[PDB]
């Protein structure tokens, strides 16, 4: 979903018309949509380097990495490698919507449920997705990085 | 709000708090005040009755209908008696800062009592309710917030 | 508030290998509010009351208890 | 000489790092207390010499040993030389009281304050009996409002109050 | 240290005279402007890195001879890159501390007060800042009131360095 | 006997013991009242649940079913039997107190 | 408490709260304010107050030789936590303003309890009496005559 | 003070009585003072713990002492935190209006944390007492009054 | 937990002192405590009639209390009244805190397991929480009406 | 159960009576029942100091005891140090018994539920449990230790 | 051993077990040897108190420091006294077999008492642990296993 489409949606199920608060919603979008796409643009760009830079801040140099940690493997570093790029993707996808509910529907449904039976550590992945906070609001500004914050922050709550 | 104080310090092994200890100071730096209300309503207590009773039967005329509990000049004489003795322990209420006297005199029972007096409670309630009203109008504005919210407690107690 | 009681309750179910001598003859401190439903447990387990007492309380007390 | 903006500076200076957006916001309070700050020592140097004086008759009020002939505030000279004390005390105050910070008064008002004290033989302990008998005149027509819109200067204020405490603790 | 505040405070203690209102205008007209160089304040320390970083790539674009040619003054090694961000780390710290102070009191003091000779001694030449700071002339990226103030702190350490 | 009775009904009530986990005794006047005598154990247990310590560990951090099968845990060291068992537990935590 | 005591007063006259009822509740509210200040520096330094109080009364006797009742670990925890309570319930009764919460907490069965147990009841009433001292040093003038007003009322209550 | 209301009139199946609605709303009222003597105690930390360990150092030398535990500077600069701990908590205090959020992390575990790290009790409210009274000097008379109440608390939980 | 208790936690565990942002959090609650202590007030004068109109709008004289429905029998139309009184009493302590975590930690726990193992209709609670919002912010006004709602749209977000 | 009830259970439930092979094994506790009784002393002894110094070893000056860390709050600190004793009691009680069953009957059952339900740090505990065990090795002997470290190592192998 | 064995059977419905017979006919057997120990530690009650005080001098200075408790003759005499009781009671626990003369004299309420008194706990365990090394060092070698173990009791119930 949207902001415009939850808006929509908000207005459909009680039969209404578009108000003017709605119109205040969506003319408000439609506001925010250049800082938007200027900041999803500059994600995009660097990728990789928000990752490095987040893994290098939390969880490298601790027992995560040593032999009994869960990275020791390497096919384990590359699943968590994996894991982090899909939070700041779809952090991105959430934030370029306006809607969390992306967050809700692709990666947070049956996430807990995976993460308990495979034995990953919740709280260092807390921990990773807050090193990821602080990399992009650093790398996009303060104005676009508390939206970034925000759902971050969500797949953060939702992960506890 | 010194019993009150007294005994949920007593529940724990600890002293008085500060915090109750700053309660405490409050309620007698208010006191004079809530002495003030009780002298207002000590003064006013026939018309206020009279006042609340009236609006009383104006709202619910059930039960000064014939079918009704108070049918006759005795019935409600006792009507009014009763709306009398709520008046008391509201006052005993501000006085006290405590909802303990007007509980474990007026409140605690009463469900079962006016079940088997056959007394409907909602008209006992509509009553007190006709007395917040008077007693609200009587006297100074957040003066009257203080006595209206005792007025509150018993009125929501009764239903 | 609080009552000083002192009652037995005999055994008429099958006879208990231990005592249950604070069981069968005691005295203990209730609280009013208790007092009532555990007065009627002993009424029911027809025990005999021997000794009721007010420890705490005054009679008569309208207000504060 | 110091500030609360350069407090600020060389405490984040011995830890050498910028200064974070937490730190900032606090100061934006100054800057909207500077409204605040500046006229109340406005008010206080407007009536300087009404506090001086009528203080003046409060610690010689209360002992009369000081204008008793053989006292330490005796003769002419020591009496003037009073006054110039009085009020050597305000300036340095005020200073404080604009500074935001009690460095200047430290280094200026009662760096070795006390020391002048048993050496010349006049008392120290007291100046400061007559010193916060200044501050409940000098809080009292800082505080009344007259003419200027209502506002809330009481936590201004408790500065003003704690100024004069820690210059009359520092001298007896 | 050197402060609007603190200007009207000695200007007035050497006098011996009380606080005139010639100078709470002085500390007025600060107050004035400490809103709007805070502004200038948050817009440098948010691009810490941005900046450092970027300043001390466009000393080694326009000056290629530092980076090639061995000795201890120039950092061909990586401990003279290492305190190449010691530097222009430490420059921009005290203009985000001048701003914060309204004046050019702890750029004064912290920074060009003995500068003057150290250059002298060391070999830093002193056209390897004053274009160092250029480069943070234009690409801090403020814009309003905020810029052009600090834009004034940037070019007052030129000054001091030519 | 009488101290390791003490400590017995904290340990069924509580699975660990109480003195860590308060910041004064609370139980002075019980444990009194105890050694004497003059209460029964069955006084003392109902006693350790009318303290505030009791609603701060099992009441407050718990919903109201929760509440049910703790206490039936507790006090009568089961879990309820059927759903009407549940039901007047339910109007006793509701038009009253725990 | 003393409001509660007032109102149970009128309440058995059946009469209402007037002035000289009034007058008592507003004696009682400018008591409470200095009852609040010494509350608080009572509760500052009680194990100060008890052990201050065994020092003086208790310690090197013949109670506390062998062969006394105070001689055992047991026995001398138990004193310790006696004296708190007299220190403590002397603190309820004198901010409740009355001393019949007081007797019915403590002086309803301590003295069939001190009868059985063999406890001395004259060695009690010093440790009182010391406590008595102690708080009177402590806290001032009239609140310490206050605190002893109830402390003085335990001691008789157990002789 | 809001919560201690809230878990009280819940555990009875009661509303919130309008008694403790007053007490809510003075709270209410005095918490701007409150606001004001926190950030006082805020601003001024390091000259209170100064002076704490001042006055503790002072009193109690054992500490200084090889055989006592805050020995050397490690351990002297551990023993000045745990007072800087004790001073925030008290703000916390403070600002919350009763002991509760102070007692949840300063006082409910203490004596045994304390027993099995080999420090005593006594110094540590020896401190605590250092504390009250610098901020007793750095206060004004009610406002010194209203900290000593929450330093009052800490001293009297760490015996 | 409370607003205060929130603000003191947050504080907390980064270990932070009380910064001005947390001065600011409560100082507007201690701004807005006034129309929560009388909003409060004037919610437990009369809860019963709250109740009352609010099954009376909602609830009555549809197939509900029709046999076949879940309200037929009167011990469930008993249970019915007790679970609204609930929602309300529960709405009033979290408008009085001023932090929806006590709705979280003994209402909304395990109730959708309840209503689901007992067959109850879960749209007919949602739609009588919703009328009990509308009854309440008519009768205690907007300004505090709004923070009613707010505690009773929680309470029916998570019971969806 | 005990060694002597294990091996009077693995004699039962075949129907076998007691072969010379049980008869070893029981003769074998008997004889080493003497320092079993002896090193069950001398832990009871000094129980505390144990703690203590095993708590200076492992957990006291890291970040679990700063702000942040899970041993920050004074109650947490009292459950760390009941943790603690729990351990060095249980595994005095495994040590007498000659058979771990007890450590999995009463300690090790759930406790992994609850220390990811708490949030509690697993490896710390284990650095913990190792540090116990290398105090108790050094106060008892080598001769004892082995058997005392074998029960710790036991609860730091089932806590993993 | 008799009193525990009894009221081990008392708890039960049953009479003495033959293996509590045997019990206390082993204890009947080794009473006399008991009785040797409790004869050396008897005579050697001087000697073996102010090693073991002078020991924990040693090791603990902070009781006779300045700061500490045991500060003074007189209040280093009764540290010695409380030495000389432990060490009776160790007696007394030899030659009962039970630990429970040991414990309902000195054991039971002990941590609370020393609390009050403002003596560390830890430093009568070491002075209790100085008396079992000297003990041990006077004692035939597996005698002085079953004096320090009664020794080692009283340690670790003491901590
Ligand atoms: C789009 C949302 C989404 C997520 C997050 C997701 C996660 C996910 N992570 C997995 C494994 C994993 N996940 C992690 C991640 C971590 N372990 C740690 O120690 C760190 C705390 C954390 C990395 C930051 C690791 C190490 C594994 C490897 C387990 C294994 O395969 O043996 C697996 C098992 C199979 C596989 O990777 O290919 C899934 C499905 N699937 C999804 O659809
Ligand atoms: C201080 C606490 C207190 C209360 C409340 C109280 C009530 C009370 N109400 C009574 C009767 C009555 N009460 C009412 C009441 C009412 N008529 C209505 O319909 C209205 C709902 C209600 C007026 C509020 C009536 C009509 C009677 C007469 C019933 C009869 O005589 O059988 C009686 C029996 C006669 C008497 O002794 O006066 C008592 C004791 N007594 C107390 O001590
Ligand atoms: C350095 C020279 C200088 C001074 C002196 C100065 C003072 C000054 N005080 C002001 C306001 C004010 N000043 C006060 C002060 C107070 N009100 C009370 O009732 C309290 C007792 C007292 C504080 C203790 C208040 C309440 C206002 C209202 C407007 C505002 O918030 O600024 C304003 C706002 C603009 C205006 O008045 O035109 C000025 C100019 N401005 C200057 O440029
Ligand atoms: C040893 C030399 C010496 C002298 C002479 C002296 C005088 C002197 N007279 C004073 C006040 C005073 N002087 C006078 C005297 C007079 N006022 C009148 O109305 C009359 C016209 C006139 C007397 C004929 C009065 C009444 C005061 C008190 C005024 C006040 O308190 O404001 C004061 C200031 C306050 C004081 O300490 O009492 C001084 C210092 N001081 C000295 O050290
Ligand atoms: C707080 C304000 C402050 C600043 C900024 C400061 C700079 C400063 N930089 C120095 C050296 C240096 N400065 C640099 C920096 C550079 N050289 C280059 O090649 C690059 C062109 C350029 C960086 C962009 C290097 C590499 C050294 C070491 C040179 C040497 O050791 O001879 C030195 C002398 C030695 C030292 O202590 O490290 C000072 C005092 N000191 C201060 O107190
Ligand atoms: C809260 C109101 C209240 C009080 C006061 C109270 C007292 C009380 N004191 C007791 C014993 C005791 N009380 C004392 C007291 C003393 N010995 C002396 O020589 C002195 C005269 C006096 C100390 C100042 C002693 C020594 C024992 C234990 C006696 C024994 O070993 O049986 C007991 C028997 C159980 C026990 O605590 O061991 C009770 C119930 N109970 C209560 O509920
Ligand atoms: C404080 C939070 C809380 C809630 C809400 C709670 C609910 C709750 N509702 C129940 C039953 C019930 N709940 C309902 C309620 C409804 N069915 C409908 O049709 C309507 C849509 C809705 C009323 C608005 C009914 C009709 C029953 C009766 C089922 C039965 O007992 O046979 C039961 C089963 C046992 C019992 O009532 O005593 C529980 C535990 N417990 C709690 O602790
Ligand atoms: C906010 C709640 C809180 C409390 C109460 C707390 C206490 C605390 N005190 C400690 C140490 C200490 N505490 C003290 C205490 C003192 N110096 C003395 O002599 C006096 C007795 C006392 C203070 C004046 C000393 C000396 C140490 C170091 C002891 C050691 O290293 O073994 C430690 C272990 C080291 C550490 O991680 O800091 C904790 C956890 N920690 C907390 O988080
Ligand atoms: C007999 C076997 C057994 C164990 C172990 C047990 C543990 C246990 N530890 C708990 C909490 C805890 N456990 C710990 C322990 C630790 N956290 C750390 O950082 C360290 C690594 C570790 C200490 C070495 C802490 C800090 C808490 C506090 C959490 C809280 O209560 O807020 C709780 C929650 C409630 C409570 O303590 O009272 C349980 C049940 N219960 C048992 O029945
Ligand atoms: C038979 C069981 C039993 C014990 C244990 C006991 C102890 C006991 N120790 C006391 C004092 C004392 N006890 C000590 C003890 C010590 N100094 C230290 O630092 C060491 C840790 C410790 C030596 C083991 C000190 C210094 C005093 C004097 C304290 C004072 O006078 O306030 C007192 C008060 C004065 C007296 O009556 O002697 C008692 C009753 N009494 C008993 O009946």
């Known amino acids: 979903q949207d902001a415009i489409t939850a808006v929509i949606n908000s207005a459909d199920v009680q039969g209404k018309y578009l108000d003017t608060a709605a119109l205040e919603k969506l003319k408000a979008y439609f506001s925010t949509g250049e800082l938007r796409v200027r900041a999803a643009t500059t994600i995009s760009a660097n990728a990789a380097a928000i990752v490095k830079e987040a893994v290098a801040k939390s969880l490298l140099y601790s027992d995560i990495t040593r032999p009994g940690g869960n990275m020791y493997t390497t096919r384990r570093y590359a699943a968590c490698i994996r894991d982090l790029d899909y939070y700041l993707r779809y952090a991105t996808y959430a934030m370029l919507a306006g809607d969390p509910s992306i967050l809700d529907e692709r990666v947070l449904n049956g996430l807990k449920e995976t993460y308990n039976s495979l034995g990953v550590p919740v709280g260092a992945t807390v921990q990773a997705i807050q090193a990821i906070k602080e990399v992009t609001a650093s790398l996009v500004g303060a104005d676009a990085g508390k939206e970034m914050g925000i759902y971050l922050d969500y797949i953060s709550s939702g992960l506890s | 709000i010194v019993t009150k104080s007294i005994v949920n310090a007593d529940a724990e092994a600890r002293y008085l708090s500060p915090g109750e200890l700053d309660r405490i100071k409050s309620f007698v730096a208010g006191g004079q005040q809530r002495l003030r209300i009780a002298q207002a309503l000590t003064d006013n207590r026939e018309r206020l009755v009279k006042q609340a009773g009236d609006q009383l039967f104006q709202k619910r005329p059930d039960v000064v209908s014939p079918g009704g509990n108070a049918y006759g000049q005795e019935m409600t004489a006792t009507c009014l008696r009763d709306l009398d003795y709520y008046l008391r322990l509201v006052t005993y209420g501000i006085v006290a800062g405590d909802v303990t006297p007007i509980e474990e005199i007026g409140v605690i029972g009463v469900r079962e009592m006016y079940k088997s007096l056959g007394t409907p409670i909602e008209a006992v309630g509509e009553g007190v309710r006709a007395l917040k009203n008077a007693a609200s109008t009587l006297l100074s504005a957040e003066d009257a917030a203080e006595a209206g919210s005792y007025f509150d407690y018993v009125v929501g107690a009764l239903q | 508030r609080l009552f000083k009681i002192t009652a037995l309750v005999p055994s008429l179910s099958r006879t208990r290998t231990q005592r249950e001598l604070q069981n069968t003859y005691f005295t203990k401190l209730v609280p009013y509010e208790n007092w009532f439903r555990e007065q009627q447990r002993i009424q029911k387990a027809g025990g005999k009351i021997i000794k009721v007492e007010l420890a705490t309380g005054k009679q008569g007390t309208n207000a504060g208890l | 000489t110091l500030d609360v903006f350069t407090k600020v500076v060389s405490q984040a200076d011995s830890r050498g790092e910028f200064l974070s957006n937490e730190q900032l916001d606090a100061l934006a309070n100054v800057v909207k207390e500077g409204n605040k700050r500046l006229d109340v020592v406005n008010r206080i140097t407007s009536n300087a010499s009404a506090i001086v004086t009528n203080a003046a008759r409060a610690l010689f009020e209360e002992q009369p040993q000081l204008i008793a002939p053989g006292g330490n505030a005796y003769t002419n000279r020591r009496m003037a030389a009073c006054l110039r004390d009085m009020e050597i005390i305000l300036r340095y105050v005020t200073y404080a009281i604009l500074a935001g910070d009690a460095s200047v008064l430290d280094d200026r008002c009662l760096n070795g304050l006390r020391e002048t004290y048993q050496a010349l033989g006049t008392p120290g302990s007291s100046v400061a009996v007559g010193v916060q008998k200044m501050k409940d005149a000098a809080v009292g027509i800082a505080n009344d409002p007259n003419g200027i819109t209502k506002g809330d200067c009481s936590q201004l204020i408790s500065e003003v109050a704690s100024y004069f405490d820690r210059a009359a603790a520092a001298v007896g | 240290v050197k402060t609007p505040i603190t200007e009207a405070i000695a200007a007035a203690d050497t006098q011996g005279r009380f606080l005139g209102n010639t100078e709470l205008q002085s500390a007025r007209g600060r107050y004035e402007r400490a809103a709007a160089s805070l502004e200038a304040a948050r817009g440098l320390t948010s691009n810490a890195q941005r900046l450092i970083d970027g300043a001390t790539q466009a000393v080694y674009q326009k000056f290629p001879y530092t980076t090639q040619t061995p000795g201890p003054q120039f950092a061909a090694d990586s401990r003279g890159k290492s305190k190449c961000a010691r530097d222009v780390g430490h420059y921009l710290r005290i203009i985000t501390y001048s701003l914060v102070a309204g004046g050019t009191g702890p750029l004064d003091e912290y920074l060009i007060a003995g500068l003057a000779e150290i250059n002298s001694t060391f070999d830093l030449s002193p056209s390897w800042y004053v274009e160092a700071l250029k480069h943070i002339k234009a690409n801090h990226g403020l814009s309003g009131q905020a810029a052009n103030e600090a834009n004034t702190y940037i070019d007052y350490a030129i000054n001091a360095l030519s | ?98």
Do not use: C
């Open chain 6, 1 to 98: 006997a009488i101290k390791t009775l003490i400590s017995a009904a904290y340990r069924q009530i509580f699975e660990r013991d109480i003195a860590p986990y308060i910041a004064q005794n609370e139980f002075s006047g019980w444990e009194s009242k105890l050694g004497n005598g003059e209460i029964t154990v069955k006084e003392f247990i109902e006693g350790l649940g009318y303290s505030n310590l009791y609603l701060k560990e099992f009441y407050t951090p718990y919903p109201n079913t929760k509440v049910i099968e703790l206490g039936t845990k507790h006090f009568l060291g089961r879990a309820p039997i059927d759903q009407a068992e549940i039901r007047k537990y339910n109007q006793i935590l509701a038009t009253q107190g725990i």
